[PDB]
């Protein structure tokens, strides 16, 4: 389908079954469907803890670098995954959400102590 405009994006395509999410890190044209045609599958991501309490993420770092060079954008979840991986800096929103969680738990603890 001849798309006007658009641009490559490295993003998560949701596969899996109901109640069982699973993501394929695919470098795809942004206008293309979420789970549709993709230029290249750069990795995978299982968001459910496995028997060892792990969320397995596989990042084809070489091709990810090649596509970032070739001019592909990064969706926010992919940016946060890379930030956790240390391939990127931690996302400003990850940091701010961590601080928000710290403040929220602090309020909860303070109220529990008071009551």
């Amino acid at each position: 389908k001849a798309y006007r405009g658009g641009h490559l994006t490295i993003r998560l395509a949701l596969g899996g079954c109901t109640n069982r999410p699973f993501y394929r890190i695919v470098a795809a044209h942004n206008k293309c469907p979420r789970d549709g045609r993709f230029v290249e599958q750069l990795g995978s991501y299982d968001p459910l803890p496995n028997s060892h309490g792990e969320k397995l993420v596989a990042l084809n770092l070489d091709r990810i670098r090649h596509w970032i060079g070739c001019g592909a954008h990064l969706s926010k979840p992919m940016e946060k995954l890379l930030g956790l991986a240390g391939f990127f800096p931690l996302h400003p929103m990850m940091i701010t959400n961590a601080e928000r969680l710290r403040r929220k738990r602090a309020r909860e603890v303070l109220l529990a102590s008071q009551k």
Binding site: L61, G83, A85, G86, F87, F88, P89
Partner: protein, 212 residues
């Protein structure tokens, strides 16, 4: 393989092109605002909530330049948003002006100037963006020296930043593999990157225009 030619397609395409060209709306129509309901009558689309106060209480660039000889050519024009969001002098030099002559009061138009953002003057003149925006103010001839007298800040910015953990590890491992045993820390140069503030004017030349 040869298909029946689609003559009507081309006919309609050219006709629509000509109609658009000949009926392109005028700035007076595109940038007209209903101060009572805060909607643009031409399209009937409300303006963002945050801009209501400015629309009600501030004047446009050509609105100011309608009360100046040569339409204020050669004067410095500033913005309320810039004045609020910065301490350094922010203003355009306003080399050229072309008002919207059909306007009842000539308060819409198209301007060209040289920007002085945060006290750094560009090396050329280019078009003024956000002319239709309601946050504008005129720099008076007097007090202009006080306004535009700026003392540059030191340019000591971090030339390099640490690599992200994993990238640094990979770089070091690759170097050791190659054979070098130098312990110099990998660093990421950031001088080639200049972080323009998010309110730096864009290129009105490439900015598009609303259609009819």
């Amino acid at each position: 393989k040869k298909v029946r030619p689609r003559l009507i397609a081309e006919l309609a395409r050219r006709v629509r092109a000509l109609r658009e060209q000949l009926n392109r709306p005028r700035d007076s129509q595109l940038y007209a605002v209903d101060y009572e309901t805060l909607t643009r009558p031409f399209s009937g689309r409300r303006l963002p909530v945050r801009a209501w106060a400015d629309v009600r209480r501030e004047s446009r660039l050509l609105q100011l330049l309608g009360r100046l000889p040569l339409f204020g050519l050669g004067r410095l024009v500033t913005r309320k948003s810039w004045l609020w969001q910065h301490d350094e002098p922010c203003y355009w030099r306003l080399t050229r002006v072309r008002p919207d002559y059909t306007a009842q009061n000539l308060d819409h138009g198209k301007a060209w100037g040289i920007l002085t953002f945060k006290g750094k003057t560009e090396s050329e003149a280019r078009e003024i963006e956000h002319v239709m925006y309601h946050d504008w103010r005129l720099v008076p001839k007097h007090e202009e020296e006080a306004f535009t007298a700026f003392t540059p800040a030191p340019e000591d910015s971090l030339a390099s930043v640490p690599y992200p953990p994993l990238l640094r590890a990979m770089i070091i491992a690759e170097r050791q593999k190659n054979g070098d045993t130098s312990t110099e820390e990998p660093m990421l140069n950031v001088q080639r990157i200049r972080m323009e503030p998010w309110d730096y004017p864009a290129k009105q030349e490439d900015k598009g225009r609303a259609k009819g």
